[PDB]
């Protein structure tokens, strides 16, 4: 779906853009730059890889993008590095970056999805599997499913999977700024409350999509964090996460729970990659590429949504329902 | 196309949302709430209407939405108000709000596009035509087009059109925050420059889509504002705006023009509705519903984008190309 065919004819389009897929341009310009400029994400990968990469170790990377993580493994002295990348253009660009860094003899980039990758494409099973395909929801880009496919077919029992652990969290919040742009009551004496019939209390929406950064606005956490699930990328699979779980939450503050905020932490040994707003205060790129997810809360199913109200010390039961692929979930007060 | 049809079976959807089209839910949840809580925008319409509405005046509104502006006209004592709303479900909701405010005798809502509105649908030609269908780009939702059509067919020579004037502005800006998420150099000694090939220096992108509020980040304006065009809604036509215009811009500061920032001003009598960041520092909801638009600036058409660099006192020539309907435009340094 060429970019130039999606643009009015009176508007100039430079040659470098004309024939590239519009969806690729959109994705790259929304988060790839932010992602590449997340210095702490880059440092996380470098430090974990530094512990495992020796001149004898082969490295397989799922989802090369710019080739940065592949370049890191080679920089660290890896025997060989194979990176796979589903986008034809990104694969070209990753090879250009590789040559620009003089690592052409060390890193091969294959244009294909990791599901199409077969043992004949690698010299031997890799000593290290490397990926960064986490979404705003941790499993939002099907990270576990892709790692699982590769794990079943191409690895060996001694392969190191980076990163090793991930945990997804939820916490109910009061947030006046969010409330202000997701609800209405009226203007002066004019009642407009029937617009509330359409309030979307089902979807998971990324904070970026609201045009809001959580670190930048005032919000109150109304309970301790709720651990929705935990994954070990070397042994878990998506069906280990139950389709429906229940959580009993004790209110530590009084207030209105406007939304559930979702964030996650990924770890390997002592190193941590977190999207908790409290950890990203001075990481603007991370907030722009991952940020956090939100779900507006409705207390019942009346013709109008009902505010979820917390009183400190009371218990509140939430039912968590997952989609079939575990990419989407929903939290409902019971 | 119903909401429930796009959602995983395991996720509960309240009855109020089930059948409503996913496009309606998305638009309402993204912009409508912020819009209705734009208190200055509401005040603007009330104060302008207050100058023209008498017990004798008939009022037609294009784009009823929640019904707010039609309710205002009724509150000021209009003889009759007809509003047209193209969304079927929104039309129903407006009627609900109209009933909740006991104004069923004064306001009627018709479900249809204004282009299908005919004189037989009105008591008589209105003394006042009212609309708020401005986008982030002033003409981004075809405001001039819809008003002109109604102006050709349904009004009378003494009909007051609200609002009367609009002016679209552009100003080159340096913004490090924007630069950090729209460009890449590399990480440490790893060069990633070739990802720059896909930098989207063509599209008009809303600040909100970048996850940024212009008010909340440091940016420098590098010249005086550039007036792209002005409109009088009672006499202007689409073709008043040339398909192409040239602007000679004088650098008032030295710096890198990372982007062109676009904002507008709509006026009627002494009253003003502006999207200039300076004017919306204390209006979060406006910044979320309208905000500003941005276009990243490329100097030439080589394999990689070239920075536009301003030297103070020097002048720079831009070619502005508009789309056929004037909804889209593009600023290119010559």
């Amino acid at each position: 779906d060429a970019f130039v065919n999606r643009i009015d004819r009176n508007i100039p389009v430079p040659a470098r853009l004309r024939h590239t897929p519009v969806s690729l341009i959109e994705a790259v310009n929304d988060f790839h730059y932010a992602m590449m400029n997340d210095e702490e994400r880059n440092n996380f990968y470098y430090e974990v890889l530094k512990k495992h990469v020796t001149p004898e170790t082969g490295v397989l990377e799922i989802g090369a993008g710019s080739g940065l993580l592949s370049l890191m493994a080679a920089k660290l002295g890896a025997k060989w590095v194979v990176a796979v990348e589903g986008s034809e253009e990104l694969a070209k660009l990753a090879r250009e970056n590789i040559r620009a860094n003089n690592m052409e003899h060390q890193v091969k980039v294959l244009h294909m999805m990791s599901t199409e990758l077969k043992s004949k494409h690698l010299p031997e099973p890799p000593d290290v599997l490397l990926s960064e395909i986490f979404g705003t929801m941790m499993l939002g880009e099907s990270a576990l499913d892709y790692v699982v496919d590769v794990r079943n077919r191409l690895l060996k029992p001694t392969t190191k999977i980076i990163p090793q652990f991930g945990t997804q969290y939820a916490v109910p919040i009061e947030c006046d700024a969010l409330h202000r742009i997701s609800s209405v009551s009226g203007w002066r004496d004019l009642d407009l409350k029937h617009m509330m019939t359409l309030q979307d209390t089902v979807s998971i929406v990324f904070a970026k999509h609201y045009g809001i950064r959580m670190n930048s606005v005032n919000f109150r956490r109304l309970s301790d964090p709720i651990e929705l699930f935990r994954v070990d990328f070397s042994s878990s699979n998506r069906n280990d996460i139950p389709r429906r779980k229940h959580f009993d939450v004790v209110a530590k503050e009084s207030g209105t729970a406007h939304a559930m905020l979702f964030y996650w932490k990924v770890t390997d040994d002592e190193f941590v990659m977190s999207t908790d707003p409290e950890d990203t205060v001075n990481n603007f790129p991370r907030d722009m590429q991952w940020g956090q997810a939100l779900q507006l809360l409705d207390a019942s199913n009346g013709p109008l949504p009902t505010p979820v109200v917390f009183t400190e010390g009371k218990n509140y039961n939430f039912e968590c329902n997952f989609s079939g692929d575990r990419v989407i979930l929903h939290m409902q007060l019971c | 196309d119903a909401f429930v049809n796009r959602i995983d079976r395991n996720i509960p959807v309240p009855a109020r949302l089930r059948h409503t089209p996913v496009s309606l839910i998305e638009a309402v949840n993204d912009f409508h709430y912020a819009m209705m809580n734009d208190e200055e925008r509401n005040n603007f319409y009330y104060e302008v209407l207050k100058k023209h509405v008498t017990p004798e005046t008939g009022v037609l509104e294009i784009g009823a939405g929640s019904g707010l502006l039609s309710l205002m006209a009724a509150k000021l004592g209009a003889k009759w108000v007809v509003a047209v709303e193209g969304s079927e479900e929104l039309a129903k909701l407006a009627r609900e709000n109209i009933r909740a405010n006991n104004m069923e005798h004064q306001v009627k809502v018709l479900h249809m596009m204004s282009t299908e509105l005919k004189s037989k649908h009105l008591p008589e030609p209105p003394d006042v035509l009212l609309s708020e269908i401005f986008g982030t780009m002033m003409l981004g939702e075809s405001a001039l087009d819809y008003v002109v059509d109604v102006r050709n067919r349904l009004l009378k020579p003494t009909t007051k059109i609200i609002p009367q004037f609009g002016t679209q502005y552009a100003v080159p800006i340096e913004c490090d925050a924007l630069h950090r998420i729209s460009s890449v150099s590399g990480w440490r000694d790893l060069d990633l420059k070739h990802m720059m090939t896909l930098q989207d220096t063509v599209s008009i992108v809303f600040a909100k889509h970048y996850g940024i509020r212009m008010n909340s980040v440091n940016f420098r304006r590098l010249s005086d504002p550039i007036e792209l065009f002005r409109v009088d809604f009672s006499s202007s036509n689409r073709n008043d705006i040339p398909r192409r215009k040239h602007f000679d811009v004088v650098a008032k500061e030295s710096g890198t023009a990372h982007a062109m920032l676009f904002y507008w001003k709509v006026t009627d009598d002494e009253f003003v509705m502006s999207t200039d960041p300076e004017d919306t520092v204390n209006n979060f909801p406006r910044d979320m519903q309208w905000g500003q638009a941005l276009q990243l600036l490329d100097a030439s058409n080589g394999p990689l984008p070239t920075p536009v660099v301003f030297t103070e006192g020097k002048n720079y020539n831009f070619e502005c190309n508009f789309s056929g309907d004037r909804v889209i435009l593009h600023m290119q340094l010559c």
Partner: peptide, 4 residues
Amino acid sequence: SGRG
């Protein structure tokens, strides 16, 4: 708007 970020990732997923």
